[PDB]
A paper describes a structure:
As the first N-terminal acetyltransferase discovered on an organelle, [name], encoded by [name] and also named as [name] ([name]), [name] or [name] ([name]), is the youngest member of the NAT family. As an N-terminal acetyltransferase, [name] can specifically catalyze acetylation of the N-terminal α-amine of most transmembrane proteins and has substrate preference towards proteins with Met-Lys-, Met-Val-, Met-Ala- and Met-Met-N-termini, thus partially overlapping substrate selectivity with NatC and NatE18. Another important feature of [name] is that this protein is anchored on the Golgi apparatus through its C-terminal membrane-integrating region and takes part in the maintaining of Golgi integrity. The structure of hNaa60 protein contains a central domain exhibiting a classic GCN5-related N-acetyltransferase (GNAT) folding, along with the extended N- and C-terminal regions.
The crystal structures of hNaa60(1-242)/Ac-CoA and hNaa60(1-199)/CoA were determined by molecular replacement and refined to 1.38 Å and 1.60 Å resolution, respectively. In the hNaa60(1-199)/CoA structure, a part of the α5-helix is deleted due to truncation of the C-terminal region. Interestingly, the remaining residues in α5-helix still form an amphipathic helix although the hydrophobic interaction with the N-terminal hydrophobic groove of a neighbor molecule is abolished and the helix is largely exposed in solvent due to different crystal packing. Upon removing the C-terminal region of hNaa60, we observed that hNaa60 (1-199) molecules pack in a different way involving the β7-β8 hairpin in the crystal, leading to about 50 degree rotation of the hairpin which moves away from the α1-α2 loop. Interestingly, in the hNaa60(1-199) crystal structure, the displaced β7-β8 hairpin opened a second way for the substrate to access the active center that would readily accommodate the binding of the H4 peptide, thus implied a potential explanation for KAT activity of this enzyme from a structural biological view. However, since hNaa60(1-242) and hNaa60(1-199) were crystallized in different crystal forms, the observed conformational change of the β7-β8 hairpin may simply be an artifact related to the different crystal packing. The electron density of Phe 34 side-chain is well defined in the hNaa60(1-242)/Ac-CoA structure, but becomes invisible in the hNaa60(1-199)/CoA structure, indicating displacement of the Phe 34 side-chain in the latter. Interestingly, in the structure of hNaa60(1-199)/CoA, the terminal thiol of CoA adopts alternative conformations. One is to approach the substrate amine (as indicated by the superimposed hNaa50/CoA/peptide structure), similar to the terminal ethanethioate of Ac-CoA in the structure of hNaa60(1-242)/Ac-CoA; the other is to approach the α1-α2 loop and away from the substrate amine.
Residue numbers in the entry:
A (entry chain A), B (entry chain A): 5 to 199
The structure:
Amino acid sequence: ERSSALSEVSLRLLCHDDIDTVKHLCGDWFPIEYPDSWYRDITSNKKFFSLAATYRGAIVGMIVAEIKNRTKIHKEDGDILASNFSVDTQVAYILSLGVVKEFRKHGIGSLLLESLKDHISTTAQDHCKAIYLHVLTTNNTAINFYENRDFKQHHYLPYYYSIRGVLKDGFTYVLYINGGHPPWTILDYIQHLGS
Amino acid sequence: ERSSALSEVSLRLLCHDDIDTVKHLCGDWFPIEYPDSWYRDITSNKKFFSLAATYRGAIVGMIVAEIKNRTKIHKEDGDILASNFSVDTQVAYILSLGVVKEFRKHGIGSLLLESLKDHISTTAQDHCKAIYLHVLTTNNTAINFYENRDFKQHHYLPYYYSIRGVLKDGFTYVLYINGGHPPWTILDYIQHLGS
Ligand SMILES: CC(C)(COP(=O)(O)OP(=O)(O)OC[C@H]1O[C@@H](n2cnc3c(N)ncnc32)[C@H](O)[C@@H]1OP(=O)(O)O)[C@@H](O)C(=O)NCCC(=O)NCCS
Ligand SMILES: CC(C)(COP(=O)(O)OP(=O)(O)OC[C@H]1O[C@@H](n2cnc3c(N)ncnc32)[C@H](O)[C@@H]1OP(=O)(O)O)[C@@H](O)C(=O)NCCC(=O)NCCS
């Protein structure tokens, strides 16, 4: 019924007209209060690669990412890349990846991810050295999907409580590309030089 | 009427019985959703210095702070102290400082702050090197109060949007004590050595 769904899937960019759909689908995945401005920006601003997967013409999945230089990484994740990667080095952050529950396990998520990788290759060549993202600790399904796709769990991010707001805990997950890697400790060097 | 209010003010620790009052007063200052567990912890856990100011026996102000080693500072604020301050160095973070609006400008906030400074001296001696806190960009009144009290604006903290949650923008404000200072740049050294 839905069994054949991948054969009826097309890829397109998000656009302003998609905002209400995007609110609905994102809200289903994640209980978080993004402002309208966030939705307008991700849907309409070319700084983002925002790609939808449609089934029978209706969005059933999306990936939203930003390719940016390493200085734009928030300090909590600054150490995803070693210091010997210069300030000009690029990374891609995945703001959102999701697929509608009924449509999961048909290969849509993988297709979206692959599409982003292709986009990175054409757009940034070998300059981009990591793709990174955040997952809630609770998301067993997502973690499995990413781990199976070579993403590594970089570190735990704790609950954050402040006047500015509250953040749930999470993990940063990173796929390294084009030779990227995290900072190396004394032992890491001892190993490479040693052996 | 309220004019004489400081003469009728007493200081006491927060306790479990205060939680509903604390929710009410904090909520009036800040629009943020702390979980019940946060309130239980700040009211009852001795890891925190949580001090209330009462007028006619009722809480009209409070300060909540935690004295902690520097490794416990979140990475966004790691650079409040220079690297030559060892890992054993302590800082105090102010989780909350507020006074009920009608009772403001009677000296209650200053008293709470001074009390924390006294607590730090007896508790940590000269080991604590900074007191730091966060304010929303919107808080003109708080900024004035802190700036007048020698706190410096260390840096801007941007809006944060993620699956984990949303944070409003803010500033980190720091008072240095016992010789504490931020990292020094090449020019900063050139100046000290130079002149
Ligand atoms: C993680 C997620 C995106 C995966 O999407 P999918 O669309 O489920 O991804 P895929 O279908 O490509 O892969 C899922 C599994 O199905 C398998 N699969 C793909 N097609 C299949 C098929 N036709 N028949 C059987 N299995 C299939 C894949 O091999 C994969 O298994 P593997 O990891 O063992 O290889 C999805 O679980 C999700 O949207 N979760 C919500 C995550 C979230 O909260 N994201 C951000 C919040 S805004
Ligand atoms: C910042 C804040 C705590 C200050 O409290 P206060 O109780 O107002 O502080 P004080 O009364 O000590 O000082 C306020 C001013 O009144 C002056 N003052 C004190 N007593 C006075 C008096 N009796 N007559 C006239 N002025 C007086 C003080 O000198 C000070 O002015 P200055 O900065 O020019 O010196 C208060 O504005 C507040 O609670 N703001 C909300 C901040 C917030 O959101 N905090 C965290 C959110 S959880």
